[PDB]
Amino acid sequence: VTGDTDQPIHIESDQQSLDMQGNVVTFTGNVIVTLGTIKINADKVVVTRPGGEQGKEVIDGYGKPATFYQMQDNGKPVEGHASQMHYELAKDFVVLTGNAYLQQVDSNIKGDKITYLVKEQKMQAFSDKGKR
């Protein structure tokens, strides 16, 4: 269920704490993040919001090991890795950076950074300006 919105983000983690200001947290211990049947295996994850000021907030994650699963629009499963992942609610996509890899039999992308557009073929090199 949604509005005319982004899908709900799901996180499974082993142990964490909650914020005394209710707005800045972390999720930790062999973590799974799930959205749109994308999977991300992680170790430490972040969610952070300004109480709803300007309606903008962000999601970040790191893994030891990290793995990024998706389906591809051509009806296939896919796997990969990256050193960090990031999302924000006006972007259509999730972005992965530092030491990144994703591959099908049809296509290979690896280097700095990965993004995948869940409607259009613009998976490309976009070599980076900060490991974050």
């Binding site: 799901h10 996180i11 999720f27």
Partner: peptide, 16 residues
């Protein structure tokens, strides 16, 4: 965003 977080370590959940 609508968020849900769940413990692997207990099998129980909360929305954000």
């Amino acid at each position: 965003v609508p968020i849900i977080y769940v413990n692997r370590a207990t099998x129980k959940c909360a929305a954000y």
